[PDB]
Design a protein around this ligand. Sequence first.
Ligand code: Y01
Ligand code: Y01
Ligand code: Y01
Ligand code: Y01
Ligand code: Y01
Ligand code: Y01
Lengths: 95, 253, 52
Amino acid sequence: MLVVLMSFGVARQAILFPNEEPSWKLAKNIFYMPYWMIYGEVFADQIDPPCGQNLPPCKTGAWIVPAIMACYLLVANILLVNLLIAVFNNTFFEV
Amino acid sequence: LGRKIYEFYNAPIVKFWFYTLAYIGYLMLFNYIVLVKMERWPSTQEWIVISYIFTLGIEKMREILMSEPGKLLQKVKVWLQEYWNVTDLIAILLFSVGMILRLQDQPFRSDGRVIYCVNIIYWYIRLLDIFGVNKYLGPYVMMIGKMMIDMMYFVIIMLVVLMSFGVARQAILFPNEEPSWKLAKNIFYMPYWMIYGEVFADQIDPPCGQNQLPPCKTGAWIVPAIMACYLLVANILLVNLLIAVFNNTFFEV
Amino acid sequence: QPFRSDGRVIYCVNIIYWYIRLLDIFGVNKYLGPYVMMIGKMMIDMMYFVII
Ligand SMILES: CC(C)CCC[C@@H](C)[C@H]1CC[C@H]2[C@@H]3CC=C4C[C@@H](OC(=O)CCC(=O)O)CC[C@]4(C)[C@H]3CC[C@]12C
Ligand SMILES: CC(C)CCC[C@@H](C)[C@H]1CC[C@H]2[C@@H]3CC=C4C[C@@H](OC(=O)CCC(=O)O)CC[C@]4(C)[C@H]3CC[C@]12C
Ligand SMILES: CC(C)CCC[C@@H](C)[C@H]1CC[C@H]2[C@@H]3CC=C4C[C@@H](OC(=O)CCC(=O)O)CC[C@]4(C)[C@H]3CC[C@]12C
Ligand SMILES: CC(C)CCC[C@@H](C)[C@H]1CC[C@H]2[C@@H]3CC=C4C[C@@H](OC(=O)CCC(=O)O)CC[C@]4(C)[C@H]3CC[C@]12C
Ligand SMILES: CC(C)CCC[C@@H](C)[C@H]1CC[C@H]2[C@@H]3CC=C4C[C@@H](OC(=O)CCC(=O)O)CC[C@]4(C)[C@H]3CC[C@]12C
Ligand SMILES: CC(C)CCC[C@@H](C)[C@H]1CC[C@H]2[C@@H]3CC=C4C[C@@H](OC(=O)CCC(=O)O)CC[C@]4(C)[C@H]3CC[C@]12C
């Protein structure tokens, strides 16, 4: 999880927020909201903010963030977690 | 000294621990350079990172030329068999084009910073290859590799169902829009995040026409029911099927 | 109208079914074909869950 979770966390804090002076909040914003989306809350209002409709301007071509996060939620909440399901199941009789 | 330094720095475990500690160090420096503002000339950290990328490209070229076949086309086939090698080539290439875009000036700079970010993705996933020395984690990553094929199926079936609600939610709720590409964003926007939690409780069943909301369109009472059938058929019918398919397959892998 | 409006609705209920008929075309594959095979067999197990 740490490797795939970190990947999305670094990516979302670098697309959305494009210009910040170096500070320790950045690591918190990596290890924040992505971790809490493997547990049920996708942070829906944060995701696809409305933008440039007569609001602050569009950060970059920030269309990467919903797509790679969709890939992340598939990878995290389905494959890995289901792997732990299977791993626990087959080691269970063994122990 | 000479023999102990040369013996020790040529033991393959030691040179492994070089290459992985240097690769973790690169990951930390590239983390810093992607989560900081970047001025027009590169910073020191970025110079170390781009040095890593181009020296890695030189070493890839070294072992392509130093491969065992004598014909050059033979050795480029030898290198294009193995999977992680070709993903190295495409990613070192895409970091190179990020560098050439970001040495320029706006509007190309913001695009180049995005290109750096989509490199951050892959250079994270290469740690899965790096974690192949462990006798305990090597099998897990091989398992993931076997479970991905089963995912290809689930995903396909899901698409059919998601899209089916997606079309129906798009037409029945929204009645009189004009030809636009937002229909596709809405087709895969609202009925996709529902399989992981958020059911969009306000967005579903708004009260219509009472102090006033616009009088609710056509026969839009049907969208909660086909929504209900969708949530059952996705979250219980398939996901659970995928649990079963992983358990059967995992045993053999 | 207003039948027009209701004529729009029951077109849209149809594309629910005509999407699900693409599962038939997925049946011909050597591997997707067996996966839709198990879906119908699990659906009788869910019918017992939907009552409970
Ligand atoms: C993926 C994880 C494990 C590592 C991620 C690394 C970064 C998120 C860290 C590593 C070095 C850190 C920096 C080290 C020292 C400082 C100095 C510190 O400066 C001050 O407090 C005041 C400075 C001034 O105004 O002179 C601000 C935080 C900062 C930039 C830190 C911000 C967070 C950084 C970039
Ligand atoms: C490897 C796994 C198993 C554990 C990794 C733990 C770290 C990722 C955590 C533990 C301590 C955390 C830090 C604890 C306190 C702070 C200070 C906090 O900075 C401030 O409150 C000052 C700046 C400001 O308030 O603006 C920023 C988050 C940070 C660096 C945290 C970032 C994330 C850290 C390094
Ligand atoms: C089903 C699986 C494959 C997931 C599919 C997800 C993507 C195809 C969707 C999900 C959310 C969508 C985004 C949601 C909203 C917007 C905002 C929209 O922004 C603007 O029009 C900006 C206007 C301006 O320039 O100010 C651009 C499309 C975009 C990024 C969408 C692009 C397509 C996305 C990433
Ligand atoms: C179910 C999935 C897999 C496919 C769904 C298909 C549609 C969502 C796409 C396919 C073709 C698209 C169309 C292709 C080109 C155009 C032209 C475009 O025209 C303009 O922007 C200018 C119009 C003008 O003022 O003349 C309007 C969107 C539209 C109709 C697109 C709307 C979205 C469409 C219908
Ligand atoms: C088969 C699965 C695994 C992937 C399918 C991917 C596509 C169905 C996605 C990926 C890219 C998406 C597009 C990315 C960007 C846009 C532009 C966006 O249009 C605008 O922002 C301009 C109009 C406006 O904002 O007013 C509308 C959604 C659309 C066509 C998205 C529609 C859905 C697309 C084609
Ligand atoms: C047992 C499992 C498989 C499904 C259980 C849930 C359904 C029985 C519920 C959930 C949502 C409900 C629907 C939510 C909203 C409406 C709109 C409602 O229309 C109005 O209220 C009129 C317009 C207005 O004034 O709002 C008619 C009932 C209906 C279709 C409800 C019928 C019963 C539904 C489908």
